[PDB]
Design a protein around this ligand. Structure first.
Ligand code: QOG
Ligand code: QOG
Ligand code: QOG
Ligand code: ZN
Ligand code: ZN
Ligand code: ZN
Lengths: 160, 160, 160
């Protein structure tokens, strides 16, 4: 009941024209979107990595081919749910998730609660155990220039 | 007694002429200082965000910046104290904080213990539950060119 | 048995021709290697810092100076083992480590189990409490251009 473990995750994707902008499962109106083989949901990927890492199950690349042509455009919420299923199968219950999105644009405040609800649904958690934070990079670097979006995540689990 | 939660925080600010350099509440001699509407204490901001995240209370931007009369002109220590108040209000106790400052200059080593003492006082924690680390970015990127200073933080809390 | 603490770590080193590439104690064939005073093992440095952080013992630069004769010529595994000894003597047992390497190249997945094996040995941990993840920076910034490699780490300990 006290075999706790922590995990941490990081991800970044380029912002490009002609792609949907999907963050935290939310399709956000914007002239650009994130580039990747999947739907490129940088927030869900970072959380997925934190969960695999807390369970010592490797990482998102190990579990989900980023090159399989059948999976082009994959829904990263389906990947997050399969991650959670494998973490559970390994014997772990999720206690909480925290995360940060770093972007110059668009404004993410109107979308954060929806992201939180998506993640909570996918992890079978109440809202009070999931947190999504959003901020800019204060004009510095490629994030300041709006060339990509970063996400960070932390997860606490317990082996039952 | 076992409802633990983790949070993670990140912040960065530009280094600019004509501002005092204040990190972890410590005024450090230096020809530049951090830019922000606040006093731009990047370390206290990262710790603040980690604490809000561990309590699933959102983030520093949702708590502090509507030109709220109580917080205009507030320094980052007052805001850290208020964050800790709101964490307690939600029924959480803080168990520990860890953090890293990334800066090419100036030398922060002589100031680390004063930062730790300031954070401990603001969070009503013993010293042995607060840690601050500092390193350079090996001359890489905007941190490496001395254009900004980054802070990272992790916090463990428990819902009593 | 319930005095849990969390720590976090970060490191980066430049990647240029002329030095071997050593990560997690593994020598990896590559046309470039990491620059630093010791062996520049960016992954072990980040994990070392997360462990000192969780124990609130400061950081790797305060424990292992480049000037101290005791550690002249010590490689990063020797430093990691001494870190673990100090964490133990401060009264903490390590519960788990998670980490991420960010590099555009080479492919690190073939070397992950070797890194995990080295880390678990140095920390006297079962293999299923040590995790290493690896991903690219999607061609963004100095990491995306192959000009350096970053590592992030998270550690959970408990005071015994
Ligand atoms: C296309 C889907 C099924 N597979 C997928 O998305 N795999 C990934 N592997 N690493 C990633 S990362 N580095 O962007 O978090 S996403
Ligand atoms: C001036 C005070 C009252 N308000 C304030 O400091 N608000 C912030 N919002 N985000 C921040 S961050 N992203 O630089 O940590 S600081
Ligand atoms: C040369 C050995 C004995 N000492 C050593 O390597 N100390 C460090 N201090 N900071 C580091 S960092 N910033 O690259 O993680 S490594
Ligand atoms: Zn991704
Ligand atoms: Zn800030
Ligand atoms: Zn290093």
């Amino acid at each position: 009941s006290m075999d706790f473990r922590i995990g941490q995750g990081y991800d970044v994707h380029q912002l490009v024209p002609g792609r949907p902008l999907i963050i935290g499962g939310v399709t956000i109106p914007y002239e650009r979107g994130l580039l990747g083989h999947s739907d490129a949901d940088v927030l869900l990927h970072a959380i997925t990595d934190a969960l695999f890492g807390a369970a010592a199950l490797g990482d998102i690349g190990r579990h989900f081919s980023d090159t399989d042509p059948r999976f082009k455009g994959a829904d990263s919420r389906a990947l997050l749910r399969e991650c959670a299923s494998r973490v559970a199968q390994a014997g772990f219950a999720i206690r909480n998730v925290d995360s940060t999105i770093i972007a110059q644009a668009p404004k993410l405040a109107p979308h954060i609660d929806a992201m939180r609800a998506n993640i909570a649904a996918d992890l079978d958690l109440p809202l009070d155990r999931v947190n999504v934070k959003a901020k800019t990079n204060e004009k510095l670097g490629y994030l300041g220039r709006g060339e990509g979006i970063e996400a960070q995540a932390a997860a606490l689990v317990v082996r039952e």
